[PDB]
RNA sequence: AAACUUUCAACAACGGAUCUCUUGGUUCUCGCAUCGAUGAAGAACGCAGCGAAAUGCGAUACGUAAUGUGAAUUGCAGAAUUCCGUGAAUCAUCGAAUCUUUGAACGCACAUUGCGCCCCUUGGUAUUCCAGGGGGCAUGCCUGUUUGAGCGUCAUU
RNA sequence: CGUGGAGGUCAGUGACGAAGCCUAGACCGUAAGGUCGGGUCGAACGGCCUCUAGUGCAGAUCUUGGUGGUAGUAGCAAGCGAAACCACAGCCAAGGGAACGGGCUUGGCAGA
RNA sequence: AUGGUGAAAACCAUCUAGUAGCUGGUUCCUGCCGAAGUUUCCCUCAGGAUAGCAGAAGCUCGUAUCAGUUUUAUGA
RNA sequence: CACGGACCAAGGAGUCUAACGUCUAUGCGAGUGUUUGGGUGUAAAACCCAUACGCGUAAUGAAAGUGAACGUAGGUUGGGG
RNA sequence: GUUUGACCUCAAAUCAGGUAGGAGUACCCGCUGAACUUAAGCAUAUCAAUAAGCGGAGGAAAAGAAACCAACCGGGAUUGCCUUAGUAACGGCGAGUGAAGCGGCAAAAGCUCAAAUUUGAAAUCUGGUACCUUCGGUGCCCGAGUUGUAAUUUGGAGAGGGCAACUUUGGGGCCGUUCCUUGUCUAUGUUCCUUGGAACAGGACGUCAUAGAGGGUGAGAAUCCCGUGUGGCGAGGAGUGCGGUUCUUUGUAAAGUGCCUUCGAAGAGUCGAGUUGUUUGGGAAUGCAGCUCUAAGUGGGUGGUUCCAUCUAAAGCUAAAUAUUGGCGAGAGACCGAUAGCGAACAAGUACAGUGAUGGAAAGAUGAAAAGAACUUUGAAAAGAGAGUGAAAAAGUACGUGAAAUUGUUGAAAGGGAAGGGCAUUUGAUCAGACAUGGUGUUUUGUGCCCUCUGCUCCUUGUGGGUAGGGGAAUCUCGCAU
């Protein structure tokens, strides 16, 4: 009986607001009299977020990821018979990594036989982009000796900023589990250790959830405890895949979609 | 409809009724014989033909002994009053086979009855007694 | 605008009736034995055909009685007459066949 | 296949008798499965279920974890399961109604009638 | 140039088409005969811890008793139940009950919630009266029954 | 060629998304229409050989429902707020045979 | 017209989806063929009775079957 | 001229039946038609069928009648083959 | 006896026992009865022995055991279906109207009065009352009833007796069957994998089937639940249909049959007759009513060419076959799917409008579960913002999909008193545009279904197929790998 269910809860949602905020009033007026009285309903009324609901070595560093010892050299390819955007992608990291060569794929060498290519001309990563259609959809991060490999999923590209040759400097943001920080650890040993201050840029790596956004900016230091900062460089988000051990023969997490059930975790 | 649009509506509940098997697999009542041959499966003139026994005497209209015997078994397998007897003690005593004196007789023989009528009674009576 | 849908319905309930009526009638044949009968009309005269019910004079040839011919399952009239020779015949040999093959149970 | 006339395969009709069920036959199109445990001692396949025995849920998102029944809910042709219950925003309980088809009986709860309910159906208590 | 008007596109609005569903309808067939002066059909006034219609019911008022089932009801609140038994239940069945004011409506009446009568009567000595409880008092007609009436007819030393 | 349902068939398609709805998307068919991509969706649906019909819309001063211009106008004896009406637009001159010039033809002209 | 309701001449409900010598409207595509605007009396006025033009099929033939034409021949 | 059109969605009009024909298809054929019915049935289906009846099979007339071979059911002429 | 007593009649009562009204109404039975409309105006024909109104019934009603149809080598109550048949017949022969007997079938069932005396016995019934085994029986009393209640008889005859060395014989319980109502029991996966919130889906592996109808369960479930299918165990009722089991059967009782003898009554203000209306298509006023007069008994009614055939009126009862838009209860569909289908899928004959009779809509879908948005914050309220539940709020009690008209915003384009359309093209924006990669001919080798040694097995005609154990490439491209 929709036409009597209509009037009687539209009565009673008037009725709610009304009854809400008349105790809201007497709230504020008890309030203006006793600041303490109010510190006592934010200790008990929590916001309760999904955040704070969550459902809860040194040898390594060197020989899975490469550190501060040599210009790192990323074999920077494409997926085979690739179009404009691939190489318009290319040409967006071709000044984000520190030492890329851009490889044409010409069908053939099936992958290791590449890895024999890269230990003779002596690469440290390959980094392969690849497109379903018109659009760029996965990005691919492999460590040369041993391979540690990293898959990826964007699905945000976006574009003022228009930087200078100053090589930028790092950030990271949430990663408290292990496989975040073993991710982390790609980002921090890829992209260049140099940081050179002045020219003021900053490359960011914020992974609130299980997605990862990376930004560039300019930060603007006023001495009254305040700073600014431009949009700058290529819009993005990643997803991790796969972390398949071997150059490409083991996993340790591929993503399912059995998981996207628990609402929380985050890997 | 109106008065159906309430019984549907109401608590009361509908007199529901399922006679529906019964109104074709009717039982055998009035022969015991048949009441166990009979085969319900089969139809009515089937059943007939079965037994041997005749469905209709008549010719039918469209198109086309173990248990007789039993029937044809069942088939191989009255008194006076006592005033009626104490009466004719009294008439044979008196005149023994007279029946022209015995009906002719007014004391014993009050209701006027023919020489054949007491005769027949008589013989009765000499089957019963002597 | 009458439709005879229940044609087949209705054939359904005259079988059953039949069937109630042997159920119960158990040994007996449905219906009652009638007579043949010589139809009237110059064009229907060379068809014979099943009559009403015999007679007195029929029954009491054939040796019954009419009280007690129905008893046992024979249709009487008393208003058809047996001006025919030839009906007269047929229909006393139908009845002595009849009397030949009934099996009248005992009252006990 | 319907070889009764009594009997209707009407989906209208069934739908209504089902829906408009009083709560005495409620109870018996609320029945649940024995485990197989149960089965092999008495004997019997399935059961109407009741309050004070215990149950283990075999089918939903509530797989595999178990309880004992609070109440009958015949109207919303559900049960109650203490202990499967779903926590509200605002730190209450409330509980899934789940359907008896889908639980699984552990351990029955006798009274006389229901052993004379297990008696009848060929049991051996 | 902006604004403005118009066109297209995107995103919002408005509206409820389309698709899919369906405790509804319509038609066909089968079976059965079941309203009322023991007061019906219908109208009205009410009744649940909390209710609009609907449904149920009549001061025993969404029921009482009986029989079966065997442990709920649940929109919310609140009681319960000895749960190895006379027993939860807005359960099923239904044969015993009550059955307000009316209505063919039936004490007299007109549209008076008035106007009464008789019987039975527990109480306020109740001998006066006063109050309560309960059942009756319509019309026509039949079978009686009864007290009569009738120069209606006859009998009668 | 298409629509609702029926028989048959494709061991047809289908929560790894049926039907529907859009789409500056693509292909086929002269066309009726059919097929496919993309987006939205949430549960059934289609081709083929046949059957059946309450089967195909631009109109009926059509029926129902919804929504405009009129208009923030008339109005209430800053706010509130219609209706009649509505194919579409509304510069002149001259010709356009036919008591027809408002769309055409040739000119004059024309700034939001 | 039937039956009813109201009232200092009416309305409601059925008969009744009443009857039209008419008004407005009539729903997909393609291909192919394709008019008539009228002869004579029923009188016409109304509706038709027929012939003509456009087809459908069967029968003989496929020809010397004809033609909105020219020519010669023979008249007023 | 005039009548219709503010716009949009949905609804919306040669249907069904009886009587009597037309042509085509199918069955059989001097016959033909089961389905008023009865029997049977896995059940309003399907499958069987008695007796009748319908229409046709042989005509010429007005009350009363008669009746089709002179016959390769004809002689000729044509006449698909 | 100027008392008194029989009856008959009229009364009476708040006596005893009853009963009739009203509702429903589809069907049925009666009564009453239009008009629009058809043939040319309308008196018939024609709408129409209709609709409305009135009265009365039932599960059916009505009809019905011949005062019938026939013309035959006769049929044989009534009702219905098929056919007779669109025939006879009628109709300003025109709109057209429209039977019946026969035949085939469905279903079949017959009987009760009044009629002449029980007269050697009113043999009958009501009611009250007392008991009993209570839809009743019995005793007793009372009344009705001779102005006739019982038995015997109804034309098919029948009765009175006589003769058969004639034949037959009631009723009450008990337990079963049967019928109705109701309860209860009866097979087999929740086995793995994938996907999804959820498995009822896909895939793999099995069982049951007289159960793979149907419905439910978080999506298409024979195998999860209820049922379904075949059976079984009951409980409470009905009952004369019969099976058994008995208890009692009586009285010169009750019939039946054939012969012989003696009798032997059957409906009146009715049939019919004239006339005025109604009824029909009714030609031999058919049927009915009103009014006048009104019969007969070797009779009377109806038909057939001078007879013959056929029934017996003026009294009554009766199932089944048949009708059915109502009621009660089912089972269904080549039906409709929310502007459809009933007016009503929902607070529907409700809201509401009318003085009133009456008229009378609109309005279905959140999800799997309310998990219906806690809590912080913007405002007196109205609504928002953070945040969260859920698979999805891109599902919010304005709630599935969410079309078009139309409206706002943003972006692009165009605009000197018209736009939209067609042919063609430029510019601007924009989308398409191979997980296409070989092919051939030689050469290393390495394997196999290749060579070779040994076999095994299904079958049908040589021109078969499947399938093992060893060896071997130094021959072989026969294939595939490098």
Redesign the pocket.
Same mark, same amino acid.
């Given at each position: 009986?929709?036409?009597?269910?209509?009037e009687?809860?539209?009565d009673i949602?008037?009725?709610?607001?009304?009854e809400?905020?008349?105790?809201?009033?007497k709230?504020?007026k008890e309030?203006r009299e006793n600041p303490e009285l109010?510190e006592q309903?934010?200790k @008990?009324?929590?916001?309760?977020?999904? @955040?704070n609901?969550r459902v809860y070595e040194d040898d390594l560093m060197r020989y899975f990821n490469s550190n501060s010892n040599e210009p790192p050299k990323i074999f920077l390819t494409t997926?085979?018979?690739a179009?404009k955007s691939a190489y318009e992608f290319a040409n967006i990291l071709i000044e984000i990594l520190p030492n890329v060569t851009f490889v044409k794929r010409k069908?053939?060498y099936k992958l290791k036989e590449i890895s024999d290519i890269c230990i003779k001309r002596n690469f440290t990563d390959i980094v392969i982009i690849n497109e379903d259609?018109?659009?760029v959809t996965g990005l691919t991060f492999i460590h040369l000796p041993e391979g540690p490999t990293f898959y990826f999923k964007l699905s945000s590209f976006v574009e003022h900023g228009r930087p200078t040759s100053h090589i930028p400097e790092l950030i990271l943001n949430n990663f408290q589990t292990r496989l975040g920080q073993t991710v982390g650890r790609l980002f921090q040993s890829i992209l260049p250790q140099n940081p050179d201050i002045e020219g003021r840029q900053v490359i960011t790596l914020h992974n609130q959830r299980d997605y990862i956004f990376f930004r560039r900016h300019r930060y603007v230091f006023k001495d009254n405890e305040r700073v600014g900062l431009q949009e700058l460089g290529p819009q993005f988000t990643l997803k991790l895949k796969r972390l398949q051990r071997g150059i490409k023969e083991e996993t340790e997490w591929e993503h399912?979609?059995?998981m996207?059930?628990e609402?929380?975790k985050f890997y | 409809?109106?008065?159906? #649009?309430?019984?549907?509506?109401?608590?009361? +509940?509908?007199?529901? #009724?399922?006679?529906?098997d019964?109104?074709r697999?009717?039982?055998?009542?009035?022969?015991?014989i048949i009441?166990a041959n009979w085969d319900y499966?089969?139809?009515?003139?089937?059943?007939y033909?079965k037994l041997g026994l005749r469905?209709?005497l008549?010719?039918?209209? +469209? +198109?086309?002994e173990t248990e007789v015997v039993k029937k044809l078994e069942?088939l191989a397998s009255?008194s006076?009053?006592?005033?009626?007897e104490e009466?004719l003690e009294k008439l044979y005593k008196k005149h023994g086979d007279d029946?022209k004196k015995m009906?002719f007789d007014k004391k014993l023989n009050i209701?006027?009855?023919?020489? +054949?009528?007491?005769? #027949? #009674?008589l013989?009765r009576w000499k089957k019963r007694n002597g | 605008?009458?439709?005879?849908?229940?044609?087949?319905?209705? *054939?359904?309930?005259?079988?059953?009736?039949?069937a109630t009526?042997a159920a119960?009638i158990?040994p007996r044949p449905?219906?009652?034995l009638?007579?043949v009968?010589?139809?009237?009309?110059?064009?229907?005269?060379? *068809?014979v055909?099943?009559?009403?019910?015999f007679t007195?004079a029929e029954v *009491?040839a054939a040796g019954l009685?009419?009280?007690?011919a129905?008893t046992i399952?024979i249709?009487?009239?008393?208003?058809?007459?047996?001006? =025919?020779?030839?009906?007269f015949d047929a229909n006393v040999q139908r009845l002595k066949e009849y009397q030949s093959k009934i099996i009248v149970?005992?009252? =006990? | 296949?319907?070889?009764?006339?009594?009997? !209707? &395969?009407?989906?209208?009709?069934?739908?209504?008798?089902?829906?408009?069920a009083? &709560?005495?036959?409620?109870?018996?199109?609320? !029945?649940?499965?024995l485990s197989?445990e149960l089965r092999a001692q008495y004997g019997?396949?399935?059961?109407?279920?009741?309050?004070?025995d215990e149950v283990l849920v075999?089918?939903?998102?509530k797989?595999g974890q178990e309880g004992k029944?609070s !109440?009958?809910?015949?109207?919303?042709?559900?049960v109650q399961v203490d202990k499967v219950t779903?926590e509200?925003?605002?730190?209450a309980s409330?509980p899934?109604?789940?359907?008896? !088809?889908?639980?699984?009986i552990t351990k029955l709860?006798?009274?006389?009638?229901?052993?004379?309910?297990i008696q009848?159906?060929?049991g051996k208590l």
């Open positions: 009986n929709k036409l009597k269910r209509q009687i809860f539209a949602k008037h009725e709610k607001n009304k809400r905020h008349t105790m809201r009033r709230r504020a309030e109010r309903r934010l @008990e009324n929590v916001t309760q977020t999904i @955040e609901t997926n085979v018979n179009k069908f053939g259609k018109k659009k399912k979609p059995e996207d059930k609402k929380k | 409809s109106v008065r159906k #649009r309430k019984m549907n509506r109401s608590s009361v +509940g509908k007199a529901t #009724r399922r006679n529906k019964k109104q697999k009717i039982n055998i009542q009035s022969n015991p009441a499966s089969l139809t009515m003139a089937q059943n033909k469905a209709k008549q010719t039918p209209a +469209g +198109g086309k069942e009255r006076q009053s006592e005033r009626e009466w029946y009906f209701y006027q009855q023919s020489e +054949g009528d007491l005769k #027949r #009674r013989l | 605008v009458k439709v005879h849908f229940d044609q087949a319905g209705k *054939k359904v309930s005259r079988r059953n009736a039949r009526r119960k158990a449905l219906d009652l009638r007579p009968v010589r139809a009237p009309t110059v064009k229907y005269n060379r *068809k055909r099943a009559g009403r019910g007195l *009491k009685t009419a009280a007690y129905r399952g249709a009487v009239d008393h208003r058809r007459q047996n001006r =025919n020779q030839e009906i149970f005992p009252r =006990n | 296949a319907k070889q009764s006339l009594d009997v !209707s &395969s009407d989906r209208r009709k069934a739908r209504k008798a089902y829906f408009t009083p &709560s005495s036959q409620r109870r018996v199109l609320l !029945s649940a499965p197989k019997i396949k399935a059961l109407p279920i009741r309050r004070d075999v089918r939903g998102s797989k029944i !109440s009958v809910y015949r109207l919303k042709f559900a779903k509200k925003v605002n730190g409330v899934i109604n789940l359907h008896p !088809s889908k639980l699984v709860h006798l009274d006389k009638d229901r052993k004379a309910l009848r159906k060929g």
